[PDB]
Amino acid sequence: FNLISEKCDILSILRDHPENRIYRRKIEELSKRFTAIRKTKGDRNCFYRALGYSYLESLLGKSREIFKFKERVLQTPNDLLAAGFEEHKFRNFFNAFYSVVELVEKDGSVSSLLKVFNDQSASDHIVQFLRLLTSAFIRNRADFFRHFIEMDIKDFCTHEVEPMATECDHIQITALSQALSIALQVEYVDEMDTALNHHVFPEAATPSVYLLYKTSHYNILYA
Numbered sequence: 001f002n003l004i005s006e007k008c009d010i011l012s013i014l015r016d017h018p019e020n021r022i023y024r025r026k027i028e029e030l031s032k033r034f035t036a037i038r039k040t041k042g043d044r045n046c047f048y049r050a051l052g053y054s055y056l057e058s059l060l061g062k063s064r065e066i067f068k069f070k071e072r073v074l075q076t077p078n079d080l081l082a083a084g085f086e087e088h089k090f091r092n093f094f095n096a097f098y099s100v101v102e103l104v105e106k107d108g109s110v111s112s113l114l115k116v117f118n119d120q121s122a123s124d125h126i127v128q129f130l131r132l133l134t135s136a137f138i139r140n141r142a143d144f145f146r147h148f149i150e151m152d153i154k155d156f157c158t159h160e161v162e163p164m165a166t167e168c169d170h171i172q173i174t175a176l177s178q179a180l181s182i183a184l185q186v187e188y189v190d191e192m193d194t195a196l197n198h199h200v201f202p203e204a205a206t207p208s209v210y211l212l213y214k215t216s217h218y219n220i221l222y223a
């Protein structure tokens, strides 16, 4: 469980910031709305790895939702082609993502999905696929995404989306959310004496996924 941990009680993360009055206050508050947390490895890939595991976990046992999601995933090679990616360069990464979607449909267990996301090879192939699809979705809508941002859209995707270990901002979150129709809520826990607060992507949606952002790092929350 070195990439995505077991579930733990929400108050188990007090020990990560002992004798820090603001962190203690905000974690206590968070515990009133959320029961449990899973931790991710902090390797620069945590947003992609967390979003993928948590969203696919949320599908388990939901046959119409899984069918509709698989239909969208089967079309994603066209997004990549339209942005200038070549099929022989993305095939290995697309096949790894399609394989874990089929595991959600056919096996259906938490334990099998956790095993794939803790297998360094399978899990890093999955993250690289998600980074290429984020890039493609931004490139194909450059006039729409100009406004979050490298001056050039193209330079930004080359440097800050496609490479492994590159950190995210609101543009990557919004783009991957839109590319896969995943509704997500991000809770923000910083060191300033401010309200605990959150953002929903997109604004009007009922989220599937809840993440905790603290110390430039994303962990998974359970409501």
Ligand SMILES: *CC(=O)NCC#Cc1ccccc1
Residues within 6 Å of the ligand: 041, 042, 043, 044, 045, 046, 047, 214, 215, 216, 217, 218
């Ligand atoms: C998303 C990601 O991989 N971020 C890097 C990090 C980190 C981190 C912060 C606090 C504790 C452990 C890891």
